[PDB]
Write an enzyme that holds these catalytic residues in place. Structure first.
Site, PDB file in Angstrom:
ATOM      1  N   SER B 164       0.741  -1.241   0.044  1.00 36.39           N
ATOM      2  CA  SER B 164      -0.034  -0.247   0.034  1.00 36.39           C
ATOM      3  C   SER B 164       0.755   1.212   0.031  1.00 36.39           C
ATOM      4  CB  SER B 164      -0.953   0.147   1.228  1.00 36.39           C
ATOM      5  OG  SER B 164      -2.207  -0.609   0.883  1.00 36.39           O
ATOM      6  N   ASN B 375       7.699   8.456   1.409  1.00 36.04           N
ATOM      7  CA  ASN B 375       6.408   7.745   1.224  1.00 36.04           C
ATOM      8  C   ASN B 375       5.373   8.773   2.040  1.00 36.04           C
ATOM      9  OD1 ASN B 375       7.162   6.729   3.732  1.00 36.04           O
ATOM     10  ND2 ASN B 375       5.422   5.265   3.564  1.00 36.04           N
ATOM     11  N   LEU B 376       4.086   8.253   1.727  1.00 31.19           N
ATOM     12  CA  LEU B 376       2.968   9.169   2.369  1.00 31.19           C
ATOM     13  C   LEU B 376       2.976   8.934   3.915  1.00 31.19           C
ATOM     14  CD1 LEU B 376       0.134  10.471   2.282  1.00 31.19           C
ATOM     15  CD2 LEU B 376      -0.882   8.259   2.182  1.00 31.19           C
ATOM     16  N   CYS B 377       3.713   7.989   4.608  1.00 29.16           N
ATOM     17  CA  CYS B 377       3.917   7.871   6.099  1.00 29.16           C
ATOM     18  C   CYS B 377       5.293   8.240   6.546  1.00 29.16           C
ATOM     19  CB  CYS B 377       3.572   6.445   6.399  1.00 29.16           C
ATOM     20  SG  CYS B 377       2.033   5.762   5.921  1.00 29.16           S
ATOM     21  N   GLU B 379       8.274   6.969   6.275  1.00 29.55           N
ATOM     22  CA  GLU B 379       9.272   6.034   6.867  1.00 29.55           C
ATOM     23  C   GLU B 379      10.027   5.210   5.714  1.00 29.55           C
ATOM     24  OE1 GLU B 379       6.055   4.906   6.566  1.00 29.55           O
ATOM     25  OE2 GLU B 379       6.428   2.915   5.686  1.00 29.55           O
ATOM     26  N   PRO B 575       3.592   3.675  10.795  1.00 28.16           N
ATOM     27  CA  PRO B 575       2.688   4.097  11.861  1.00 28.16           C
ATOM     28  C   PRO B 575       1.969   2.750  12.546  1.00 28.16           C
ATOM     29  CG  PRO B 575       1.909   5.221  10.020  1.00 28.16           C
ATOM     30  CD  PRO B 575       3.300   4.535   9.550  1.00 28.16           C
TER      31      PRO B 575
END
Ligand SMILES: Cc1cn([C@H]2C[C@H](O)[C@@H](COP(=O)(O)OP(=O)(O)OP(=O)(O)O)O2)c(=O)[nH]c1=O
Ligand SMILES: Nc1nc2c(ncn2[C@H]2C[C@H](O)[C@@H](COP(=O)(O)OP(=O)(O)O)O2)c(=O)[nH]1
Ligand SMILES: Nc1nc2c(ncn2[C@H]2C[C@H](O)[C@@H](COP(=O)(O)OP(=O)(O)O)O2)c(=O)[nH]1
Ligand SMILES: [Mg+2]
Ligand SMILES: [Mg+2]
Ligand SMILES: [Mn+2]
Ligand SMILES: [Mn+2]
Ligand SMILES: [Mn+2]
Ligand SMILES: [Mn+2]
Lengths: 289, 683, 683, 289
Positions: B164, B375-377, B379, B575
């Protein structure tokens, strides 16, 4: 946090009675039975009478006691809609559907009606009891106002929405839908003003105000059930109208920041078809550790 | 009001001056006995259930055919032999509302926790019964949790992708921008978050083939991507989430940041597009000395040097760019830009901050490429190569776009089982399997990089839960000592498993020979420094478990030199949002936001105490906002030195904290080696 | 104030009760001798000029290299021998502001009218000196005017494409939607207007792989396309222009129309995207009978029947769709939809109205496909086949996307020179050359259809100018008689030229043998009905010019049957917006809007009298708003019967007329055989 | 004989400041001297204060005491215009032309300005002195309201009109002209209601009411002179504005049915220069030709 947003939504919803041509309703009105015409007339007069109290007393009295220029302006706008737009709209619907003598008789009947009077006078009583600089009495009146805007009107709105959802009396149904859309936002707005007062209170005072609100709701609800049977038994709709009252009672409670009182129920599908912390500069030595 | 909801609500009812924490066991028991056992479809035998699931288009027959039914029955026996019980109502509720398999009308329940774990393990093992039983033991003991995509979708016929997080490079061309929009929509359709590097795109007011001042900049592409993500909304199920990254030395950096202002114009504001800012050490050096900085037009740099501005080292190239008359730039105030960043993070939590030189000074694959964005998070920190998507008739030059597979160790359960090595190696095997079985047909660079890099992300969670349940404060030096030792062991065993996989398959990742693993430069701090605990209490936590020494690290270095390394990247601490409830764990390595979590589901409000919260450990469960963010930075930097990728680092701020305080936290994170900063959460 | 615009403003100063029309001659004379000759770069000889233009990347060397410089000199002498003089200030101003070549800094003027015409002619002739001289004579006499793209870019190095109208079919897939967005941006980057058919896209609330209520409908794709066209705006000098077309029986038709309402929200409204509605005869029949119509979900029809809804005959399949339980349909009121269309056209001018059965009952290539949508200008009506853009690794099935080259005959100058045949044939040759030299390498279906269909559009302008300057009212039957004869002759000579080109090149357009030209059915009304003028006044207008009879049409039919046709489509009457000023002609075949046109350019106000306007023909120049739209419909339908494609038909409405009057005009246009209605312009 | 036509006129005049884009005034504003900008800000701030109190207090209180649902609807509409439209429009102007600190400062300046406080004290005092069923106290408040509508606004209106007439600040000026158009009809309407009450009195009582009206006018006038000098001396216009306010005082008296009190004077000619398609249903015969 909310008054300018409600100002915007209110003024952009502005409308006038003249915009909807009413005469084409006579093409479906003539095909209703006597009981249907009777119920419609009585419901319409009920809404008219309650809305007049809101225009002459409810909104102006709240505008008078609420502090804040912007809130007073929004409240003034809402009072204007009651008196200048809604009242003329109800009159227009009546004049289109009934002759003068029939209108006078229906209003005489509804004016004497026990269930309409009970709720009308209960609400008006709370508006008359507001005292200068007493936020508790103001809150109680706001609760009454929210109950009128978001709950008491709906035993009445049911019928025009029921016809509107069936393709009958479409012009007056469009008018009623615009009125209802105004009352919805009025109820939400006054609800936020009531929550502001409620949140300034102690825990004991809060519990006491909750008891007041629930007790008032109960009195009005039990009278609504009687009002409902009195008007809707003759057209076989009372069971479904009762579900609609409870659903709208729950909305009124949520407007006041309270939990729903009644279990969730589905509504008649015909009626449904009708419906910045603080900027501080970096002063060096913040890059060294 | 449901009986379990009432029982869960009695936690807040204080009896004898204490919360009734024991009511949540009653709450979960009532929830099960009254709802789950009633709504769970039961079959006479496991064979009938499996046949119903495969034939009704619920499972995949391919992976189940790899075992005889006796092996599958024994795997299910192993799952149910543990008699796993959800400790809290929220764990069971989250599992049976998010991950449990339901009927096509979402009315009944086909999968229990044991069934889901057995199916995931059978998919992981790929035909090995003993391996499947090992995965079952690992997951039913809740030592390892596969990510939400893997856990939810593994072994399902109507499944999304098991990955994802995707990271796309966007080249400075209309062909490449259109391809980026297409690939973003295709990946968001699969349910994955997409991160796009916009640093190569030329700024606003640049020339397009002799027509000067014709480019809308990165904000036009931002609007295109925002609408692309809004359209590709995962079949109307979950809102399409994407991220855009821009270098702080990009000319459009101020326009990039203005897209997140509350007063932003509707022709500038982006709604579904998160933003991250990449900050090289040069910008921090310029802001530190208050020298006026320059942002550069990327196309002028590309024309002058033949290389993209973000492809070059700003530390050595900044003076050359400034002194080059053919490179276009405008003066900025780096301190004012930092204050604007802090103000934006206070107002909206954006942008993400990626410290470019913190990432690349310890990056093991700088020969392949430098890490340019996350990335979107925030990490995933891996090397990427931009693709050259040419005209329709021509052949495209496919690069490397990042996409790694996520998994999380449960630190509490791994520590109580004394199974760091076994859990790490089995998680590495499962992540490797997920990487091999992932094939994406509409992102050629993502597919090529998945096949070549074989990068995985093995995270950790329940750090604060494990520490608070062991009487250790999160900000204490003993907590950092435990994090140091634990994540050194995790890194050691992940490297060992990767080298073992490389030896077994006889292959390493592409361009491994240029990596710091091949040259041994990676292992310098491990063969020179001892990472055993410095506190007797922490050293007692690792009793019965061999902590790798300097000699063990030298042996691992020799083994990696001899046999290579299978994964370019192994560890990233995501997360771990919703899988933390199912595992009864605190989210990621972050400290807890609240001691007891108050949430509303439907019309009923629910209460979730942090896992293991009680009267004895109440004050060890210190809320993140009450904590010193400098000590949280210290903890994350202690962990970050053993994680090859980044860590999702959320800043937890009070309302009283100013812009200067947020800037100080960011600068201390940069000073301490923090690679990325995820979110600025204000109370 | 400039002297020339001061002289041009003396037209409105009424002397002796009359407009001073002769001031515009003085205005243009002053304009030239005070601005143009001063700002014109003059070279010692034409050789130095051509060398300067080729060397400094102004011209293309390839096309100029096919002629010896003596031939180029002869062509330029032929252009300058005419000694062309602009009759009005607006003509010269528009030419030297829009089409005349200027230096790289937009400072001086490189091309005169003769230079531009000579370059365009040498580009058209492709090495032939005599053909280049013929083209020079054709354009310097202003008998034929190449479209704005061709006239502006012919022979220029840093140029856009010579075609600006493109029509794209979008298939019902995310890959096809992404490719449509990419191709739309690529073609808008080239400067062309792009029209897209959105009828094959499934409606809102349809399933995407067995998850229901997942599709966002055509409005999400509309927002994607609107932002794609906003992004590709070419500096914003001419922002990206797109058109979307939807069949009236699409379920999303009401949401498609709601994107143009003034009260539309920012999350729905599209601004840069024009909209057109395709109305089959079935919808008009349903509205006429006041019956209950049904809009359909396209994906249900495709699943049930294997074909798209717009690929099927609605007049024969509507009842089957209604009776089919597996087809999903929504009940609508067709008269309410018609009233909504009229209201939307009154308030915004949208949507464009295409009468699908009016287009397809006379369409010559229904074997290839039926016409399903029009272009952005609502006059291109050609068969299209949708493409199947697959995943990246798979091969794409390329269909046929429409594009035609535009060119207008000047009816006044063609009739004055008695040169219908020669002008039509030379214009056909020039349009064929433009089609052959066009190669779009980022729109595969546009390229394939350009190579296969070889479609051209030969329009006309100055119809109202010619009639008013000949004492004929636009609404008069004599005007329609002239239009009938003139456009029958144009059709005859265009068919003759197409057949001659097919005979010379030995090839016809793809799938010609299935066309009505091959079967001979196209020529039925031409071999049966005589189109000679019925009025003696009109018959004298054609004196000295042979009018083909029924025998001539029979001979042409035999010639076509024995040699074939090179162009699938030949004639389309475009709006011809800005080239009408340069040619001193009224726009297209539509009537004039203003007798004297007042415009403000920068901070200067200038007035443009209609070409040839005087006191002797003041009332023959009746404004379009003052005339009966029924008679204008009659005129356009008279012209349309000789035009294979459509005519950009603008409706000129007064403020007094209601939506019922607009609906009556639309229904009379449908009754009279009008193929498309372009705009509802209100005064 | 008049309420219905005033109702129709008021509702047909409905507008919102957002209908007028203000960014066009940015340059002519930038070009004014500091003295001119200061006077302009202060002038509009004085107007804002008057409309704030007319909307919050004056119009609602008069509405409360005037009998008849239609008369109340007109007065409620006028009240809404005062605070929801007029008072707010000034903030739209301020937010366009001025930085926040200058806006904050001018609102602080209204609070401490002695002439503006005095005029508010006097007008609002009379509004709040109205006694239920006491027509004389109501008359006195209506006189005060007419003086606010038709006299007191004009020391403020002068300056936007003065600029509008020179082709300066024309967007702001357009807003002001709309406000002025409203106040003119508000002053006439309230004037007619005041005359109704006056006409019920004995000759002796009438004589006292004229004394009240003239004494009040003179007291307000003397204060307005000082206010005018305070604002306009720095732009050189005080004498011109004074002539304008006297002109409008006469109009206020006339709205009350009284003779003009000040002699006629020549007003600055600049200031004098400062002053969907119908839906028709388709017929069956429309589909055949
Ligand atoms: C992926 C996606 C598709 N769609 C719509 C647009 C397309 O016209 C339509 C087809 O999408 P497809 O790309 O064809 O999806 P699919 O092939 O997996 O589904 P199916 O088997 O039904 O063909 O779905 C959306 O509205 N939103 C989305 O996110
Ligand atoms: N019977 C049954 N077993 C199930 C189901 N879902 C999961 N299981 C697990 C429980 C056991 O560990 C395993 C085998 O169950 P079974 O087929 O009843 O086995 P057995 O005990 O009859 O040999 O499958 C289910 O729906 N039914
Ligand atoms: N001299 C010259 N001629 C130009 C220019 N632009 C167009 N022409 C045209 C004018 C003539 O018709 C043609 C030849 O001009 P030339 O080269 O001066 O030849 P000539 O006059 O010696 O025969 O070229 C131009 O810039 N200079
Ligand atoms: Mg390029
Ligand atoms: Mg598909
Ligand atoms: Mn009302
Ligand atoms: Mn109300
Ligand atoms: Mn006012
Ligand atoms: Mn007023």
């Amino acid at each position: 946090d909310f008054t300018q947003m409600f100002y915007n939504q209110n003024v952009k919803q502005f409308w006038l009675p003249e915009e909807i041509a009413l005469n084409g309703d006579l093409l479906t009105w003539k095909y209703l039975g006597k009981n249907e015409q009777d119920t419609y007339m009585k419901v319409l007069a009920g809404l008219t009478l309650l809305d007049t109290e809101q225009g002459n007393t409810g909104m102006p009295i709240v505008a008078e006691h609420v502090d804040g220029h912007q809130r007073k302006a929004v409240l003034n706008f809402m009072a204007m809609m009651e008196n200048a737009v809604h009242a003329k709209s109800y009159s227009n619907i009546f004049m289109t559907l009934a002759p003068t003598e029939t209108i006078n008789e229906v209003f005489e009947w509804v004016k004497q009606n026990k269930y309409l009077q009970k709720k009308a006078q209960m609400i008006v009583g709370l508006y008359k009891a507001i005292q200068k600089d007493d936020e508790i009495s103001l809150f109680k009146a706001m609760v009454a106002s929210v109950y009128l805007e978001s709950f008491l009107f709906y035993s009445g709105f049911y019928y025009p929405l029921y016809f509107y959802g069936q393709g009958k009396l479409m012009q007056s149904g469009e008018i009623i839908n615009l009125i209802l859309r105004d009352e919805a936002i009025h109820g939400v707005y006054v609800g936020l003003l009531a929550q502001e007062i409620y949140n300034k209170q102690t825990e004991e005072k809060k519990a006491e105000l909750r008891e007041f609100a629930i007790d008032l709701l109960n009195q009005l609800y039990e009278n609504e059930l009687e009002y409902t049977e009195d008007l809707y038994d003759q057209v076989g709709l009372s069971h479904d109208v009762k579900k609609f009252i409870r659903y709208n009672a729950n909305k009124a409670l949520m407007n006041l920041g309270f939990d729903p009182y009644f279990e969730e129920e589905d509504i008649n599908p015909i009626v449904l078809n009708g419906l910045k912390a603080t900027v501080e500069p970096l002063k060096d030595d913040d890059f060294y550790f | 009001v449901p009986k379990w909801i009432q029982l869960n609500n009695e936690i807040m009812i204080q009896k004898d001056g204490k919360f009734q924490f024991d009511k949540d066991k009653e709450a979960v028991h009532s929830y099960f006995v009254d709802y789950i056992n009633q709504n769970t479809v039961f079959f006479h035998n496991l064979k009938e259930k499996l046949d119903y699931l495969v034939e009704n288009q619920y499972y995949e027959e391919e992976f189940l055919s790899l075992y005889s039914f006796e092996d599958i029955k024994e795997v299910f026996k192993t799952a149910y032999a543990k008699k796993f019980r959800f400790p809290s109502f929220m764990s069971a509720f989250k599992f049976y509302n998010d991950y449990a398999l339901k009927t096509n009308d979402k009315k009944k329940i086909l999968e229990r926790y044991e069934d889901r774990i057995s199916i995931v393990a059978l998919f992981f093992a790929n035909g090995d019964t003993e391996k499947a039983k090992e995965y079952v033991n690992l997951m039913i003991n809740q030592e390892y949790q596969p990510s939400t995509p893997t856990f939810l979708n593994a072994g399902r016929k109507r499944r999304g992708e098991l990955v994802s997080c995707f990271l796309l490079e966007v080249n400075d061309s209309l062909n490449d921008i259109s391809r980026a929009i297409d690939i973003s929509m295709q990946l968001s359709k699969l349910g994955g978050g997409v991160s796009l590097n916009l640093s190569k795109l030329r700024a606003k007011g640049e020339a397009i083939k002799d027509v000067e001042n014709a480019t809308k900049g990165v904000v036009g592409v931002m609007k295109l991507l925002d609408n692309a993500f809004r359209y590709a909304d995962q079949m109307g199920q979950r809102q399409g989430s994407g991220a855009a990254y821009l270098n702080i030395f990009h000319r459009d950096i101020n326009d990039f940041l203005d897209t997140k202002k509350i007063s932003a114009d509707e022709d500038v504001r982006v709604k579904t597009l998160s933003i991250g800012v990449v900050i090289p050490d040069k910008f921090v050096e310029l802001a530190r000395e208050d020298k006026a900085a320059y942002v550069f037009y990327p196309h002028t740099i590309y024309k002058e040097y033949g290389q993209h501005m973000d492809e070059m080292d700003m530390n050595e190239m900044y003076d050359k760019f400034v002194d080059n008359p053919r490179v276009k730039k405008e003066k900025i105030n780096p301190r004012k830009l930092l204050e604007k960043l802090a103000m934006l993070r206070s107002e909206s939590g954006y942008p993400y901050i990626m410290f470019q030189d913190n990432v690349n000074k310890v990056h093991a694959n700088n020969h392949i490429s430098k890490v340019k964005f996350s990335n979107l998070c925030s990490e995933v920190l891996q090397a990427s190569q931009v693709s050259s998507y040419t005209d329709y008739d021509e052949e495209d030059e496919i690069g490397l776009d990042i996409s790694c597979n996520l998994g999380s160790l449960n630190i509490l359960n791994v520590m109580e089982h004394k199974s760091i090595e076994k859990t790490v190696k089995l998680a590495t095997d499962s992540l490797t399997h997920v990487s091999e079985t992932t094939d994406i047909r509409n992102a050629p660079a993502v597919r090529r990089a998945n096949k070549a890099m074989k990068s995985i992300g093995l995270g950790a969670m329940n750090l604060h839960g494990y520490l608070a349940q062991n009487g250790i404060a999160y900000e204490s030096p003993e907590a950092r000592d435990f994090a140091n030792t634990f994540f050194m062991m995790v890194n050691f065993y992940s490297i060992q498993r990767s080298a073992e996989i490389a030896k077994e398959k006889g292959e390493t990742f592409d361009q491994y020979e240029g990596s710091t693993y091949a040259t041994g430069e990676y292992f310098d701090k491990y063969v020179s420094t001892d990472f055993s605990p410095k506190y007797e209490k922490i050293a007692n936590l690792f009793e019965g478990m061999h902590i790798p020494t300097t000699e063990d690290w030298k042996k691992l270095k020799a083994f990696v030199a001899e046999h290579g390394m299978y994964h370019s990247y192994r560890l990233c601490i995501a997360p771990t949002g919703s899988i933390s409830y199912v595992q009864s764990s605190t989210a990621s390595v972050m400290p807890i936001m609240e001691r007891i979590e108050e949430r509303t589901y439907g019309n009923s409000k629910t209460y979730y105490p942090m896992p293991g919260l009680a009267s004895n450990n109440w004050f060890f469960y210190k809320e993140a906002y009450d904590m010193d963010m400098f000590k949280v930075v210290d903890m994350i930097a202690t962990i970050q030195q053993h994680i090859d990728q980044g860590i999702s680092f959320t800043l937890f701020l009070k309302d009283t904290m100013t812009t200067r305080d947020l800037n100080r936290i960011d600068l201390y994170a940069h000073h301490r080696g923090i690679k990325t900063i995820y979110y600025a959460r204000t109370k």
